[PDB]
Design a protein around this ligand. Sequence first.
Ligand code: K
Ligand code: K
Ligand code: K
Ligand code: K
Ligand code: K
Ligand code: K
Ligand code: K
Ligand code: K
Ligand code: K
Ligand code: MG
Ligand code: MG
Ligand code: MG
Ligand code: MG
Ligand code: MG
Ligand code: MG
Ligand code: MG
Ligand code: MG
Ligand code: MG
Ligand code: MG
Ligand code: MG
Ligand code: MG
Ligand code: MG
Ligand code: MG
Ligand code: MG
Ligand code: MG
Ligand code: MG
Ligand code: MG
Ligand code: MG
Ligand code: MG
Ligand code: MG
Ligand code: MG
Ligand code: MG
Ligand code: MG
Ligand code: MG
Ligand code: MG
Ligand code: MG
Ligand code: MG
Lengths: 110, 386
Amino acid sequence: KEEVVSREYTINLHKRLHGCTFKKKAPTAIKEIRKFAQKAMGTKDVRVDVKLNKQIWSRGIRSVPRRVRVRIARKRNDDEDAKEELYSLVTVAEIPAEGLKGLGTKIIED
Amino acid sequence: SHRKFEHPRHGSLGFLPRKRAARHRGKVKAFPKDDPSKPCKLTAFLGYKAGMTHIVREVEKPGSKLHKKETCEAVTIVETPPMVIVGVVGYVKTPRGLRCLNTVWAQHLSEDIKRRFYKNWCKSKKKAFLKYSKKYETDEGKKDIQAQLEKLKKYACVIRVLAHTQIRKMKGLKQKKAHLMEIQVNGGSIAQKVDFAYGFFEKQVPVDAVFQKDEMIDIIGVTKGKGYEGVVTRWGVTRLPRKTHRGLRKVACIGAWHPARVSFTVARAGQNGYHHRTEMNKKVYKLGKVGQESHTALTEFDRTEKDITPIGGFPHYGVVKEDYLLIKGCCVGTKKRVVTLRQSLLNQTSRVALEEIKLKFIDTSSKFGHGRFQTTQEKQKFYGRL
RNA sequence: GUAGUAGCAAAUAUUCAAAUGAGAACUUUGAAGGCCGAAGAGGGGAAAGGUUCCAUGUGAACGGCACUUGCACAUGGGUUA
RNA sequence: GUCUCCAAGGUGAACAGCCUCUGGUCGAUGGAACAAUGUAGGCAAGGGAAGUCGGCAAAAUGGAUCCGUAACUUCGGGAAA
RNA sequence: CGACGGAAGCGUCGCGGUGACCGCCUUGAAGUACAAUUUCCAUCGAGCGGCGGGUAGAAUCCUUUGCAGACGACUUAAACGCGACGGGGUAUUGUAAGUGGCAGAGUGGCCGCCACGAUCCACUGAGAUUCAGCCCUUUGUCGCUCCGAUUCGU
Ligand SMILES: [K+]
Ligand SMILES: [K+]
Ligand SMILES: [K+]
Ligand SMILES: [K+]
Ligand SMILES: [K+]
Ligand SMILES: [K+]
Ligand SMILES: [K+]
Ligand SMILES: [K+]
Ligand SMILES: [K+]
Ligand SMILES: [Mg+2]
Ligand SMILES: [Mg+2]
Ligand SMILES: [Mg+2]
Ligand SMILES: [Mg+2]
Ligand SMILES: [Mg+2]
Ligand SMILES: [Mg+2]
Ligand SMILES: [Mg+2]
Ligand SMILES: [Mg+2]
Ligand SMILES: [Mg+2]
Ligand SMILES: [Mg+2]
Ligand SMILES: [Mg+2]
Ligand SMILES: [Mg+2]
Ligand SMILES: [Mg+2]
Ligand SMILES: [Mg+2]
Ligand SMILES: [Mg+2]
Ligand SMILES: [Mg+2]
Ligand SMILES: [Mg+2]
Ligand SMILES: [Mg+2]
Ligand SMILES: [Mg+2]
Ligand SMILES: [Mg+2]
Ligand SMILES: [Mg+2]
Ligand SMILES: [Mg+2]
Ligand SMILES: [Mg+2]
Ligand SMILES: [Mg+2]
Ligand SMILES: [Mg+2]
Ligand SMILES: [Mg+2]
Ligand SMILES: [Mg+2]
Ligand SMILES: [Mg+2]
């Protein structure tokens, strides 16, 4: 519909990382988030903000958060002969006072 | 030299090869012997394995330790919604066995059955049986259809109906492509069989028309798959000593020097599970008809108002809402696997076969844990409505 | 022929962003998560080696994957009683 | 395989093991799956060596405080009996 | 065309149409010089150029599913349902954090007040987790509904 769009998602990392090896759990979370953005935005080029990477690794390589609230912003790449026209940037999102209860997908305005 | 000590061989050579079955739906290898003096009746039915539970009943077995006592025995729930007849096929007896003479289909076929004829239904143009269905729309075409039926009445010796399940009615299966099979018609003359089959075109046949309560049936299906497996698990050979170099889950000697070949009777690692099996003498404890008290888990002794489905649903299956059969013991295959029910080929005369079942209690607690509540209302009342 | 087969598996572990480049899982910077845990995977020296030291650059070969990399190759510099 | 010098904090009898600071480092080719067999590490109802040439392997015991400690003895021990 | 034939019927029979043979008549054969396969049949298969009629699809790869699985393979799904959240059901553990307490062995200051205190009680069968191969599902939120590729013919 619109190439430039931003939304907030709650990714259930617990079920995606179920039964994963400890030494690859947090690294696998990065891959799962990258795959999640591709399906939700249809852009192969996905960039993970360093703050989100810090949150994923906050509790070490084993204990990844069960659920994470993230903002995915699809935007146009303006570099000479970019491999892809668009790319997705995944960053951390604020959690309301009530937490992740009753919180669905939300579209962020301009 | 002779083996030092004698024990029976491991495994059965009558179930070889232990390969993956070439089918997913259970095939009826043999139908019950036909008795012309009896009315026309179907001999088989398709169902889906929903899950297991246990029941309690008071045994009536004179001379037994359990006489007038209560016994708890496992049962399997098979959801058996009515099947739809969509065609008839006749066979002629020849010196080379039965040969298919002709196949006559119904004018209207559901989308679910038409999916069985495609590998990608959505991408196709859905042309199946479109031209065939047109000849039902013309007088000359109708005469041809009737002529084919008369041809079966004259030459056919075995008549089978084409029936498919209404798989859409069980949303838990997550499948829209129905299962089709040939069900033989026993009883009456050949003409009656054709008239019996043609009369059911596009109509539904309930499970009660095939089976009933307290009778012995055979269950056919494909066992649970387990992939590549070693000899110890696959064949049951004993493990080797702890100090065995290069492993102990093996057969030590796979053959003598002569014959200078490995025989087919030696246990070898390979495919385990997903094998076609035909199990006999499964008693029907209960037949649940939708819209009747028989569909619920009520008993003459337990008046609690509850359904057959345990609270939380049947694991990996869902909620049973259609007709179902309560069968003693265990059933082949995983949850949701289609199973074939067949009438017994033997004459049931044993006391166990003729025993009249009377259930006292049917357990409906959650099977996803150590369930202690038979109903959701009971659980809510326990926690002050929680 | 065997054969693109046997095989690459000890010493806990990598991840994100950006820069550079024809080319980056392997170079550099930053951030994070781990390890050696002072009888060290830290800081020196004696034997032994002999330029492997330092800077810049690099077609191939070599570093049993790869490399923009270097204890490799090329040019120059460097050891003061 | 190869001589030697310097040696922080916590726990503790302890340059034991385990964790940390200074300093060093993520160097061991990577990716995807989670079959058999294997290697390494575990656990297990009831029985408890029936296994096996043989208790092989594993399990059990384990620190400290108080009590108590036999035969035998070269009078010292045995004894952490 | 009609009837019959189902053991592999693919043939038989009847009627009608049509050709040949036969019947009658006419005409020819050689110098193909003394033999040189007596080429000409039906069994399908066809390959082509034309003249008519007829027909207007699938499979596989990519994706998805876990009733399957070493890899292949297999069972599912692909304009409406699916997918991502969330809610409910179900289950595991055993009562969260915060706040308050005239609960608490006691102890230190001040003139009952203040401070320290493991633990305890109330809110609280609470909180956390719950398909990753559990069940139901818009009360509610959001997205996607198909760019393609490889082949296959009596
Ligand atoms: K022998
Ligand atoms: K068994
Ligand atoms: K054994
Ligand atoms: K030296
Ligand atoms: K000097
Ligand atoms: K293994
Ligand atoms: K023994
Ligand atoms: K609390
Ligand atoms: K409580
Ligand atoms: Mg013998
Ligand atoms: Mg047979
Ligand atoms: Mg399996
Ligand atoms: Mg040995
Ligand atoms: Mg269970
Ligand atoms: Mg190899
Ligand atoms: Mg090796
Ligand atoms: Mg590897
Ligand atoms: Mg290693
Ligand atoms: Mg590395
Ligand atoms: Mg260590
Ligand atoms: Mg450490
Ligand atoms: Mg020292
Ligand atoms: Mg190399
Ligand atoms: Mg250097
Ligand atoms: Mg050099
Ligand atoms: Mg101390
Ligand atoms: Mg120490
Ligand atoms: Mg035991
Ligand atoms: Mg025990
Ligand atoms: Mg004992
Ligand atoms: Mg013995
Ligand atoms: Mg013995
Ligand atoms: Mg002995
Ligand atoms: Mg030992
Ligand atoms: Mg002694
Ligand atoms: Mg939920
Ligand atoms: Mg699923």
